[PDB]
């Protein structure tokens, strides 16, 4: 078996290899990339997402989210407090202010140390889940707004036509902005392009070991666990690499820089943080191998987890028994 230690693999496709998205994902998996839960793809030197990022300051962040932590330095939850709208230009200025700017540091490792030591004592503001794209319409390869849809994949594989659409989302981050431990909706893949700015550090648990992380989370967040059988779907829980090591949870880490893609694989739990002002674009996607994961995906039915409209059809077709209880939850 390829990649038995479940290491994060890094790929450097040629421009010829970059022409067929589906084929390249399949190639990565033939090399065992999915076993890690996460892969990095560095695009060919000839490729570009767009010409420049010069005129993005007028994008609106309608609902910036202040990420307020509770708990201990290595085991905490965060909740999102809504703030007044601001443009990307205003947000960038805020990110760079004395209150919010990245502190002096020696290297990525030093910054990582500072993040886990001090994250809980600050409340950075994140511009997350903004529908839109920064890919030039003329960028034909790996354009996250031009991927085959999950609905079309499910139709190709299962012969059923369903309603729904899926489109990309933009994320504007600053120092300490955090993504909590989670897998994707329906345990889909995700792909994430860092368009500009400072890096993003990722942590990931191999899909074959996801239940180990779930068991630890139930122990560390006992009230949350009693409230919901799939509370990680709420996307609020953080556990540090030190705490993971102390509890024998297998995981890896890698830092993504501007101009690089990351792919998360079905049922690959991931979490992370931004180093400073940045902008990423991400979208979910599927392949034939996803279908079996979609059929088995846990669901939140306590009401907390947000459902896109399109998730309805996925649950209805792949999980008809659960459909009753789940739909009562989102209503
Ligand atoms: C950038 C480039 C240039 C020539 C052929 C193909 C490409 S690609 N696949 O878009 O990266
Ligand atoms: C609020 C909090 C804080 C730290 C650990 C666990 C929790 S929770 N959501 O009560 O399980
Ligand atoms: C538990 C821990 C904590 C920090 C560094 C290393 C470890 S260990 N003994 O390698 O799992
Ligand atoms: C023990 C160790 C050390 C470094 C990175 C990851 C691990 S773990 N918890 O074995 O995956
Ligand atoms: O970038 C972020 O804040 C979170 N991104 C993801 O979880 C993803 O791309 O799957
Ligand atoms: Ni994700
Ligand atoms: Zn729930």
UniProtKB/Swiss-Prot annotation:
An example GO biological process term is: double-strand break repair via homologous recombination
JmjC domain location, by residue? 136-302
Binding-site positions, 2-oxoglutarate: 126, 192, 200, 235
Per UniProt, Zn(2+) binds at 228, 234, 300, 302
Which residues get modified to PolyADP-ribosyl glutamic acid? 16-17
User: What cofactor is this protein dependent on?
Assistant: Fe(2+)
Q: Which UniProt keywords apply?
A: ADP-ribosylation, Chromatin regulator, Dioxygenase, Iron, Metal-binding, Nucleus, Oxidoreductase, Transcription, Transcription regulation, Ubl conjugation, Zinc
Boundaries of each JmjN domain copy?
8-50
* One GO term describing the cellular component: pericentric heterochromatin
Q: What is its EC number?
A: 1.14.11.66
Which residues are Fe cation-binding? 182, 184, 270
User: Molecular function (GO) terms listed?
Assistant: chromatin DNA binding; damaged DNA binding; histone demethylase activity; histone H3K9 demethylase activity; histone H3K9me2/H3K9me3 demethylase activity; metal ion binding
Residues annotated as signal peptide: none
Q: How is it modified after translation?
A: Ubiquitinated via 'Lys-63'-linked ubiquitin chains. Deubiquitinated by USP14 with the help of TRIM14 leading to stabilization.
Q: How is the cofactor bound?
A: Binds 1 Fe(2+) ion per subunit.
Q: What is the catalytic activity of this protein?
A: N(6),N(6),N(6)-trimethyl-L-lysyl(9)-[histone H3] + 2 2-oxoglutarate + 2 O2 = N(6)-methyl-L-lysyl(9)-[histone H3] + 2 formaldehyde + 2 succinate + 2 CO2
Q: Where in the cell is it found?
A: Nucleus
User: What does the similarity note say?
Assistant: Belongs to the JHDM3 histone demethylase family.
What does this protein do, in the record's words?
Answer: Histone demethylase that specifically demethylates 'Lys-9' of histone H3, thereby playing a central role in histone code. Does not demethylate histone H3 'Lys-4', H3 'Lys-27', H3 'Lys-36' nor H4 'Lys-20'. Demethylates both di- and trimethylated H3 'Lys-9' residue, while it has no activity on monomethylated residues. Demethylation of Lys residue generates formaldehyde and succinate.
Q: What name goes with this protein?
A: Lysine-specific demethylase 4D
Q: What is the lineage of its organism?
A: Eukaryota, Metazoa, Chordata, Craniata, Vertebrata
**Residue window of the full protein shown:** 11 to 341 of 523
